[PDB]
């Protein structure tokens, strides 16, 4: 609240300093921001405690940055950490005390939890509460009465208005409890699903699963893990532990196929007990319990084919022990979020690898599913070797003079097609691909503009893939990339970042970017995180190049796009010039070729 002569807020008169400040490695700002030391001997204990009570926002190598909020404190209470149980240790760890503001915030957030519980039974959602005064003073606003369908006091609530009531309670200061007591539940018989000994659970996976199962009752929340870290395995383990009917929701055909494959590989459950509620193919969804389907189908708003209507009615009628949702970052979308209310589930677990978006709808996930239970430390995984180390780099390509002339002259938005296609970046990508090809490194080129992708691919006679590409040709190209030594590069379009199971690649060049999309950046980066059989963290075998054009809007987009990665800790090294480019022969070495490319770009319209 107090501002120094500079921008930083003043806290000299706010909180004191502990005498043994050197011993205490923890800081506590009044706003809730906490700065932990990664060099302290008790760093591991401090990390565990701060991860338990707070969500990371920036975890560089030296000083980690966390911030706590109501959702994080509710998650702490869910895993069973009381207000004293957290605040006493927070004061002990803190080297400068705990401000009264944070003290009262923690007390209020902890006490305002568990008073209101939401439990669905016999397809009816009852708002139970041991304390009756909570309901007595909660029925002040008319929205509760209109929403409601027309000790231990409970009342039934309308299915459709659950989301509205939950978001209302969040700001009403009485969070709802979504814990599932699968251990004590006889209404829905347990499913015959077990985890085979073959599956191996990594320490971070086990920690995330523990945070989810803080107690005997499973907690509904979101666990963010890298795509290469085995989030599919974590979800399968969660379903197996729940031992009740599980509905996994993918985002595409590839996602559902991969989910079925993961289920069969890691769970002893028989093949016949798994169904694919997919329009392309179905396996008698009503027949078995464990189901894999898609948001588009479940939230489909237009006409429903009679068979799918029967399946949808069956799904609505039945109650699901677990609702796994992969790629939760798309949930807050209108149709996708409608699925949450369409289907009934005790706990709706969420898994993803890029929980970031521009529109401020990510906060809605906290109530749509639950608090962010776990968020894996990418740097720690890199050190442990579970994830391939990546030498993140941004190659600056100076824009050609004529191209810059037209780009600046035109105030329209042909610049997206223009600066994405310039001779300098073309030569840079050509030279980089040549260097990695002679180095036997697998290349996955990326480009949002299909026009630019096709032009580059024809000029380099490479197998570009994109949306309306035939599925058979897509599979053939991927198989050739994985097996044929003569080819070691594939030019994938935006479809690549959506969802795929692609072979591990040693480099990932991105000539063009869709825009300031942290989601796309992280999605494309996750491709090369696949750990090799015998690599090492320090070898930096994996490389990521984000080619950008100097003095162009692409620079702003790249800087706005690398925020999530830098927050994780990746250091994007800038490359102004590439050694050997002048000696190496490359296309567009003369003014004329740039002229024809510019003419084609202009005629593109």
């Amino acid at each position: 609240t107090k501002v120094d002569e500079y921008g930083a807020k003043d806290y000299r008169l706010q909180m004191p300093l502990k005498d043994d400040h050197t011993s205490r490695p923890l800081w506590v700002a009044p706003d809730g921001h906490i700065f932990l030391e990664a060099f302290s001997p008790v760093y591991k204990y401090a990390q565990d405690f701060l991860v338990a009570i707070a969500e990371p926002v920036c975890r560089p190598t030296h000083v980690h940055e966390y911030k706590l909020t109501a959702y994080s404190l509710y998650a702490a209470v869910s895993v069973g950490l009381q207000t004293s149980d957290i605040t006493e240790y927070l004061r002990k760890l803190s080297k400068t005390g705990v401000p009264d503001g944070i003290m009262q915030f923690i007390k209020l957030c902890t006490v305002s939890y568990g008073k209101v519980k939401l439990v669905l039974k016999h397809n009816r959602y009852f708002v139970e509460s041991c304390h009756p005064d909570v309901i007595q003073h909660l029925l002040q606003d008319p929205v509760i009465r209109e929403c409601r369908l027309r000790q231990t006091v409970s009342f039934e609530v309308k299915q459709e208005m659950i989301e509205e009531l939950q978001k209302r309670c969040i700001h009403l200061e009485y969070p709802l409890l979504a814990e599932y007591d699968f251990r004590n539940d006889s209404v829905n018989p347990d499913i015959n699903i077990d985890l085979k000994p073959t599956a191996v659970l990594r320490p971070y996976q086990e920690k995330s699963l523990r945070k989810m199962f803080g107690n005997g009752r499973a907690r509904s929340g979101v666990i963010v893990l890298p795509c290469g870290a085995g989030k599919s395995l974590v979800g399968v383990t969660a379903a197996c532990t729940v031992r009740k009917r599980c509905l996994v929701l993918g985002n595409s055909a590839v996602s559902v196929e991969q989910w079925k494959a993961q289920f069969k590989m890691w769970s002893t459950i028989d093949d016949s007990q798994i169904c694919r509620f997919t329009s392309d193919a179905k396996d008698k969804p009503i027949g078995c319990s464990v189901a894999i389907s898609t948001y588009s189908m479940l939230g489909h708003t237009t006409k429903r084919s009679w068979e799918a209507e029967r399946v949808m009615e069956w799904l609505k009628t039945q109650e699901w022990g677990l609702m796994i949702l992969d790629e939760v970052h798309t949930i807050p979308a209108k149709m996708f979020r409608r699925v949450l209310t369409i289907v009934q589930a005790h706990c709706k677990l969420g898994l993803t690898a890029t929980l970031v978006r521009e529109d401020d709808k990510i906060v809605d996930l906290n109530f749509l599913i639950g608090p962010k239970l776990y968020e894996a430390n990418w740097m720690e995984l890199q050190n442990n070797g579970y994830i391939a180390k990546v030498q993140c780099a941004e190659v600056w390509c100076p824009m050609s003079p004529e191209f810059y002339r037209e780009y600046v002259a035109i105030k329209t938005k042909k610049r997206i097609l223009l600066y994405t296609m310039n001779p300098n970046k073309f030569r840079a990508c050509q030279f980089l691909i040549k260097f990695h090809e002679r180095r036997n490194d697998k290349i996955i080129v990326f480009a949002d503009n299909v026009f630019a992708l096709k032009e580059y691919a024809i000029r380099l006679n490479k197998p570009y893939i994109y949306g309306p590409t035939s599925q058979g040709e897509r599979m053939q190209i991927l198989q050739n990339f994985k097996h044929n030594p003569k080819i070691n590069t594939i030019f994938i379009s935006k479809v690549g970042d959506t969802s795929f199971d692609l072979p591990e690649a040693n480099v990932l060049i991105q000539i063009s970017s869709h825009g300031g999309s942290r989601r796309q950046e992280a999605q494309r980066l996750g491709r090369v995180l696949r750990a090799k059989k015998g690599m090492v963290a320090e070898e930096y075998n994996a490389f990521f190049y984000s080619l950008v054009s100097q003095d162009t809007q692409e620079m702003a987009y790249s800087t706005k796009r690398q925020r999530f990665l830098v927050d994780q800790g990746y250091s994007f090294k800038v490359i102004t010039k590439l050694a050997g480019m002048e000696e190496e022969d490359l296309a567009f070495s003369t003014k004329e070729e740039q002229q024809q490319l510019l003419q084609k770009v202009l005629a593109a319209t």
Binding site: Y45, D48, N215, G216
Partner: peptide, 18 residues
């Protein structure tokens, strides 16, 4: 037959005392 996760949180910091 329950799993280790159902037991409870590890509470890794509880070991340290001052």
């Amino acid at each position: 037959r329950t799993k280790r996760w159902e037991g409870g949180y590890e509470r890794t910091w509880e070991i340290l005392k001052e």
